[PDB]
Amino acid sequence: MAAMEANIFCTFDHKLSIADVGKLTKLVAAVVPIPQRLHLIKHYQLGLHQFVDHTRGYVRLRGLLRNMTLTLMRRVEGNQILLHVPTHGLLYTVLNTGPVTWEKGDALCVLPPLFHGPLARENLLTLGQWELVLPWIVPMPLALEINQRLLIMGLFSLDRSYEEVKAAVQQLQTITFRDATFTIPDPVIDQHLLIDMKTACLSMSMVANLASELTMTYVRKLALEDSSMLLVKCQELLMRLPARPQHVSPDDEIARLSALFVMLRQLDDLIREQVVFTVCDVSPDNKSATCIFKG
Amino acid sequence: RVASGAGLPTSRQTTIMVTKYSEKSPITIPFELSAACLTYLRETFEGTI
């Protein structure tokens, strides 16, 4: 039928002041998500603002952003915006909208914004109580930290007392990454985090069941003859309790490790975020970088 | 087609082809001639008045 459009024109039916257009011009080469593809769309569908809801949960907003299609902004005109849908493997220029510092060679992920500093950056296109909310583009370690914090809060919430749950949420929600401090907004625990908790519990059960005695005993045996800061900091986490291996069978070990890899992938996937960009350049003011698009 | 505004799906080009067929109807009527008429037209104009 009608082939999917690569170039999308967006028109604001609200009237624009010169300040609004000036703000729009700064946003060229940034990433904006849209829910559906048409040659000509209205500004209401543009951005992340449409999904802001009384539920307020960070996890559900993260889920919603994952399903939107990503576009880059081409140059602006009067009352019009041109968006381009990138293709896998090509080279692009992208704008660092958020305060996160990028580095050469790292991988970037798209994620809902989390507040930082004075929390007064929100000048982006407030017109008719619609707002231009854009997602953050962050490097992989920060996304992994965010997802890990959310899942750990969810798991810890079970059966713990309410006040100590509050304390744990307070200490976990704040993150220091690459010499900057960020904090996760609205870490609500609900069904969306519950399904991830269920899958994590299943994967951990299977990992505990599968692991061979050799794997379990490696750490215990190593401590008898090695000594290092890594090891001593490592063994502090474990419960406090010559010989020969009771059973040697390389084929069983191979098959068991083969299954254990699948289970570890299952556990890894729920904190992994899909890489959208891989960067190899940076403006020395960190405002822009050139990246390869993927996904 | 009509040009559409923002947010509306555009109408695609459409081609339509059709065929019309014809009908059959025969009509007939009989008439007959006496053998006397046949022999009068067959042979000579002669004899009594």
Tell me which of A1, A5, A8, A40 to substitute to probe the interface with B (most B C-beta atoms closer than 10 Å). Answer: A40
Can you tell me the distance from the alpha carbon of A9 to that of A30, in angstroms, rounded to the nearest whole number? 15
Can you tell me the distance from the alpha carbon of A227 to that of A229, in angstroms, rounded to the nearest whole number? 7
Enclosing H/E stretch for B46: none
Type of residue at A22: G
Torsion angle, alpha carbons of A105, A110, A116, A118, to 10: 110
A39 interfacial to chain B (CB closer than 8 Å): yes
Which of A132, A121, A41 lies closest to A82, judged by CA? A41
Is A42 in Cβ contact with B10 (below 8 Å)? no
Q: Work out the burial of residue A21: count CB atoms within 10 Å of its CB; fewer than 13 is exposed, 13-18 middle, 19 or more buried.
A: middle
Expt. technique: cryo-EM
| Neighbouring residues of A145: CB distance < 8 A, sequence distance ≥ 6 | A175, A177
Can you tell me the distance from the alpha carbon of A207 to that of B5, in angstroms, rounded to the nearest whole number? 56
Coil, strand or helix at A9: strand
Which phi and psi angles does A236 have, rounded to 5°? -60, -25
CB-CB contact of A94 with A17 (8 Å):
no
| Neighbouring residues of A111: CB distance < 8 A, sequence distance ≥ 6 | A62, A65, A135, A136, A137, A138, A143, A146, A273
A3 interfacial to chain B (CB closer than 8 Å): no
Q: Work out the burial of residue A43: count CB atoms within 10 Å of its CB; fewer than 13 is exposed, 13-18 middle, 19 or more buried.
A: buried
Type of residue at A146: I
A40 interfacial to chain B (CB closer than 8 Å): yes
Q: Where are the beta strands (DSSP E) in chain A?
A: 7-11, 31-34, 40-42, 69-77, 80-84, 91-95, 107-111, 136-139, 174-177, 180-183, 277-279, 288-293
Enclosing H/E stretch for A144: helix A140-157
CB-CB contact of A95 with A289 (8 Å):
no
CB-CB contact of A89 with A278 (8 Å):
no
Is A40 in Cβ contact with B5 (below 8 Å)? yes
Helical packing angle, A140-157 and A191-210, nearest 10° = 90
Given CA atoms A224, A227, A230, A236 in this order, what sign does their dihedral have?
positive
Count Cα neighbours of B46 within 13 Å in the Cβ-side half-sphere.
3
B9 interfacial to chain A (CB closer than 8 Å): yes
